[PDB]
Protein: Spike glycoprotein
Amino acid sequence: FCGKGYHLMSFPQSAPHGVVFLHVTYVPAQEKNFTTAPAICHDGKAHFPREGVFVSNGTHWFVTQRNFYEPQIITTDNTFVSGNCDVVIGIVNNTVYDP
Amino acid sequence: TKCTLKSFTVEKGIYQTSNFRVQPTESIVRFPNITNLCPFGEVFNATRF
Amino acid sequence: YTMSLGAENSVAYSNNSIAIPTNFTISVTTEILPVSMTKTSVDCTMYICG
Amino acid sequence: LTGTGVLTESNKKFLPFQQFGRDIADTTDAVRDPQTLEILDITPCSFGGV
Amino acid sequence: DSTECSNLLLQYGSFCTQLNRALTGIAVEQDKNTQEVFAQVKQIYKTPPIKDFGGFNFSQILPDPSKPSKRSFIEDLLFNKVTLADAGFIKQYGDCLGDIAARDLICAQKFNGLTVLPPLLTDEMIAQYTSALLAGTITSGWTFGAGAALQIPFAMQMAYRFNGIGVTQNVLYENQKLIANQFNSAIGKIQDSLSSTA
Ligand SMILES: *[C@@H]1O[C@H](CO)[C@@H](O[C@@H]2O[C@H](CO)[C@@H](O)[C@H](O)[C@H]2NC(C)=O)[C@H](O)[C@H]1NC(C)=O
Ligand SMILES: *[C@@H]1O[C@H](CO)[C@@H](O[C@@H]2O[C@H](CO)[C@@H](O)[C@H](O)[C@H]2NC(C)=O)[C@H](O)[C@H]1NC(C)=O
Ligand SMILES: *[C@@H]1O[C@H](CO)[C@@H](O[C@@H]2O[C@H](CO)[C@@H](O)[C@H](O)[C@H]2NC(C)=O)[C@H](O)[C@H]1NC(C)=O
Ligand SMILES: *[C@@H]1O[C@H](CO)[C@@H](O[C@@H]2O[C@H](CO)[C@@H](O)[C@H](O)[C@H]2NC(C)=O)[C@H](O)[C@H]1NC(C)=O
Ligand SMILES: *[C@@H]1O[C@H](CO)[C@@H](O[C@@H]2O[C@H](CO)[C@@H](O)[C@H](O)[C@H]2NC(C)=O)[C@H](O)[C@H]1NC(C)=O
Ligand SMILES: *[C@@H]1O[C@H](CO)[C@@H](O)[C@H](O)[C@H]1NC(C)=O
Ligand SMILES: *[C@@H]1O[C@H](CO)[C@@H](O)[C@H](O)[C@H]1NC(C)=O
Ligand SMILES: *[C@@H]1O[C@H](CO)[C@@H](O)[C@H](O)[C@H]1NC(C)=O
Ligand SMILES: *[C@@H]1O[C@H](CO)[C@@H](O)[C@H](O)[C@H]1NC(C)=O
Structure:
């Protein structure tokens, strides 16, 4: 609607019989593949991400926001628990570290 | 404005009005300086056509 | 020529794979949009009579 | 050529075989006066820009 | 068939030229309408082979590569339902009234000058835009036109879209099979409704 990428700002400028918008937008680049999971079964209970997604680098699991790779250690503050892990399809086994 | 809108009540705003204000009172005729009469006697009253 | 529909590229879909960016660019683009046109009117007495 | 309007002095130049002037081709603007050979341009009496 | 066609053109040509400039502006407006509806994102994504859509059966809207046409099943039903010029006017016109992509010069003669201009976007190019929109949507979600489409599993996109309506992801991930079955049943009821000739 207001430029390619994620919109941030738009600056109007007057123009002969019109207006010119200077759209300042966020264009992502240098993407990386990651092995992702919907939830994590720890201690017999499923942990779902409060914000972001569960991805893995090598054999270590982190939670990151979707639009930028910021690896954060999986924490009980970062996740929420709902039910058991027998019902979630695609759940992986990992530990949820507590502060 | 009333004659342009064909109504005795006009509303608030601007209105473009056609000309009714000026009427010509004098007429001028300008012809070339010609004195002699045309020879229609030669054309019309010739002995033989 | 034929009209270009867009940039040809492919994306690899998998049930356990995601793509997350590691960098970004801040891009300023210009979009030009007309707002008004030339306001014109006709004068009736000059148009009809002259 | 009969009409109703106002005349001004014009800076136009006429060829010797030309008598009337029509830049818009539906209104006679410039004319050559028959007695004095000055060229007078005719604008309408109606000031409709009101 | 006038003998004095040049004089008739000199006396009445600019009137028809203005009217034809109005009709051409209308036709260009129709082309801009088609572009602003279908060509919002000018990126063409190839249709993926059907592989792990989370139980969501998209085969009726996502087009098959086996057919020579780019259309899908539901699209085929939509174009088969609306026959062009299937109206009383067809008997007099001979289908000259609408674009069959085969209209010939004889139709202009029948309509006294009136011609039907073909659209700028071929129905193949509209079906390709629709297929690119579908493939990009299913594969990526919101990152489609943001540039650099970022692959994501469809279940996680559905979890994010439940987060959009204020429902936690556990509702989806506990009831994924039920939601997929409901979606497939709704798609089947739409197909049967389009196939019912109503
Ligand atoms: C994935 O990335 C994380 C974060 O960089 C790695 O975790 C750290 O890696 C460094 C270098 O290997 C170690 O010195 C730290 O002790 C690690 N800390 C943690 C959180 O364990 C992680 O090793 C990477 N995994 C793989 C296998 O690539
Ligand atoms: C996650 O770990 C649990 C054990 O903590 C696994 O559950 C066991 O899996 C083995 C092999 O399938 C079975 O023989 C046991 O009967 C299971 N025990 C339980 C507690 O159910 C579970 O399969 C692992 N899941 C993943 C994704 O690897
Ligand atoms: C992301 O890309 C930007 C450029 O778009 C990189 O910025 C450059 O950083 C290097 C090293 O610090 C400088 O030498 C360049 O002058 C910078 N260029 C610009 C455009 O400012 C940035 O480092 C990249 N980040 C990653 C992680 O690749
Ligand atoms: C999605 O549903 C369609 C039907 O709407 C499935 O197509 C059927 O495939 C089966 C064989 O598996 C045939 O017996 C049917 O006759 C097919 N119907 C039609 C009209 O094609 C399609 O296989 C389903 N997709 C998946 C993978 O579940
Ligand atoms: C909510 O309603 C849905 C149907 O809209 C129920 O789903 C059915 O569940 C029963 C029992 O598990 C199954 O026999 C049916 O096959 C399901 N139907 C569908 C469409 O999948 C669901 O159980 C209801 N939930 C509650 C708590 O009432
Ligand atoms: C991600 O994986 C696909 C297929 O495995 C590959 O085509 C693509 O280049 C990969 N991207 C990165 C950034 O590794
Ligand atoms: C992804 O697909 C592969 C191949 O069908 C399958 O083995 C795997 O279990 C699937 N994973 C999930 C989470 O659906
Ligand atoms: C036309 O000629 C006749 C013959 O001389 C003459 O009697 C008459 O007056 C003339 N009429 C005019 C108008 O000159
Ligand atoms: C026309 O004749 C009048 C009367 O003698 C004279 O005043 C005027 O100058 C003449 N105009 C010419 C010769 O252009």
User: Anything to note?
Assistant: The two ends of chain B are 65 Å apart (CA to CA). Chain B has two helices and no strands.
